[PDB]
Amino acid sequence: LYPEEILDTHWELWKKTHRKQYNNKVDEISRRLIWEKNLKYISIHNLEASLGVHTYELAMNHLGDMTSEEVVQKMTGLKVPLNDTLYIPEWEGRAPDSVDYRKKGYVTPVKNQGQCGSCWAFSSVGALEGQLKKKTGKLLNLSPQNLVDCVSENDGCGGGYMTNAFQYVQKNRGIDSEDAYPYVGQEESCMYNPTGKAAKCRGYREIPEGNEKALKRAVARVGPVSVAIDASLTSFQFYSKGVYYDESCNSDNLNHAVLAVGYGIQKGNKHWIIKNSWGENWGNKGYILMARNKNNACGIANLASFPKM
Amino acid sequence: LYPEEILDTHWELWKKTHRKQYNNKVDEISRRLIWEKNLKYISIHNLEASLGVHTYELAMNHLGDMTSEEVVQKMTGLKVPLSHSRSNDTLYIPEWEGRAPDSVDYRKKGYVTPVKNQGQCGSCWAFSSVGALEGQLKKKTGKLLNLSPQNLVDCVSENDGCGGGYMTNAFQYVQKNRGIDSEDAYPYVGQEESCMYNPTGKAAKCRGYREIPEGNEKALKRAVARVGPVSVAIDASLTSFQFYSKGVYYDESCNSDNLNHAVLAVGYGIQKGNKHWIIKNSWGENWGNKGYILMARNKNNACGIANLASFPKM
């Protein structure tokens, strides 16, 4: 096809705004055509939204010139795996109608992986940081690169699971801090340095498969929990605000690792407050509210786990 | 030209959602083409917004199938005089003393009435006047009543009814009439009729009016802070305004000298670093943010916001 002459000035602005560069002008045109196709999806989606069709709206972000598949390919990293770990929570303790660890100082700044399937690393690091604060009272930026370069059971930027990350930290008797082992985004030879140790782990616990109720209690009593979801949809790729819910979200197509930092209600829609790894320039300042209690949307309660420390 | 076959299902949904009906198929097509042209404006505007170009976003509303001009034609009603007054009358608020609140929102203080809808009648002046009066009725008697704009439409002879008018004349009328009916005593019908002001249903009176210094936002702020809701005139001829959804409205194309709408300033504050006036519109709550719109405050008198401000003295 041909680019829409109207959006010329816009494409240039978008490229500038996101440090987007293209090797060949051919390469560029091809991208420009994807960006434009997406813009249409976004614009028409928002129309349906105003017509009461969706509980959320979309927006053009830094993933504008990428197809959903490319995003799932280059920007996820969850590898589904194949007794003493369960945590079927009891009912009595606490069941606050709403919880938001961002306010309690348990959550660290939204970070950005990008071009490396290290989401598992970030989710693990996310849960650990929540516990570090809950225990020591200090909120530190732990090192995901440490996990990427050292969790041998995981394929580094090729992907992996959170459990293995937890187990590693335990058997390694420690995990570095972001400062002691900065995220470079690429796979490297393990360089875990004892000096920069900043947290430890004494096991892990898994939330009953597909049990949102159990997951709620878990988030309420333990704190932030690592969860896996299906992020293969364009609606998710361009989420801007609102309660995310898409019937096309396959519960069995888990491919992303995010951090559940709380839950609540918004305009009559129950939801989980999720923290993503694609920088704060995506979603609502880095976060996304996902439909809670809606038949386990996107497999939200399928691979939940949190470190025991 | 020519409706993109994609939006077919959508156009039908939109029409349903807004009880939109058309006589001819021809008439309908013509409208469908306007709706689509607007949708594009909206969608591309929001793109620029995400790119940091606008401090606000747009959305498809019930005015979707209307051009800006039609909206300004059938849905405003502010009509500047060309030669205002038959002399003066001490009309001019002279500021105050002390420091002023950084934020004020009369909606919370129970001074504001439900967002109403004029539509297809240039009675905005009526609504703005009634808006300010209601603010004072409460401030004085402690009661919040729905006053009658239809009363103003049908009786303010100096104004052209649904053909338009100014707020001042509305105030003066109520004074010389020694009263104004309540919405219940004189329901807004939307059409011009023979005056039927009934004394029995009187609900408020007015003892004059005061005008805020032309183009003085500082003075206007104090006014809103000390007196309460103030009647103001703005330039509502832009599509960005026609489809405002949320955020601080600010458009460089807003002509300070093209005042054509009468709204009610019910407060002010800051939002995400942008100072703003909280404005109340007359196009129902199905427009703007539940009927309201935040307009850029202290930004070189945006849209002439401080050009024709006034409030009743009662």
Swiss-Prot record, chain A:
Cell location: Lysosome; Secreted; Apical cell membrane
Positions annotated as propeptide: 1-94
GO biological process: bone resorption; collagen catabolic process; extracellular matrix disassembly; mitophagy; negative regulation of cartilage development; proteolysis; proteolysis involved in protein catabolic process; thyroid hormone generation
InterPro entries linked to this entry: Papain-like_cys_pep_sf, Pept_asp_AS, Pept_cys_AS, Pept_his_AS, Peptidase_C1A, Peptidase_C1A_C, Peptidase_C1A_papain-like, Prot_inhib_I29
Main location: other
Catalytic activity: Broad proteolytic activity. With small-molecule substrates and inhibitors, the major determinant of specificity is P2, which is preferably Leu, Met > Phe, and not Arg
Pfam families (UniProt xref): Inhibitor_I29 (PF08246), Peptidase_C1 (PF00112)
The protein's enzyme class: hydrolase
Active site: C119, H256, N276
Source superkingdom: Eukaryota
Topology within the bilayer: Peripheral membrane protein
GO cellular component, one term: lysosome
Residues bearing carbohydrate: N83
Enzyme Commission number: 3.4.22.38
Cysteines paired by S-S bonds: C116-C157, C150-C190, C249-C298
An MF annotation (GO) of this entry: collagen binding
Keywords: Cell membrane, Disease variant, Disulfide bond, Glycoprotein, Hydrolase, Lysosome, Membrane, Protease, Secreted, Signal, Thiol protease, Zymogen
Tissue distribution of the protein: Predominantly expressed in osteoclasts (bones). Expressed in thyroid epithelial cells.
Family: Belongs to the peptidase C1 family.
Functional note: Thiol protease involved in osteoclastic bone resorption and may participate partially in the disorder of bone remodeling. Displays potent endoprotease activity against fibrinogen at acid pH. May play an important role in extracellular matrix degradation. Involved in the release of thyroid hormone thyroxine (T4) by limited proteolysis of TG/thyroglobulin in the thyroid follicle lumen.
Disease implicated: Pycnodysostosis: A rare autosomal recessive bone disorder characterized by deformity of the skull, maxilla and phalanges, osteosclerosis, and fragility of bone.
Name of the featured protein: Cathepsin K
Organism annotation: Homo sapiens (Human)
Upper taxonomic lineage: Eukaryota, Metazoa, Chordata, Craniata, Vertebrata
Chain's gene name: CTSK
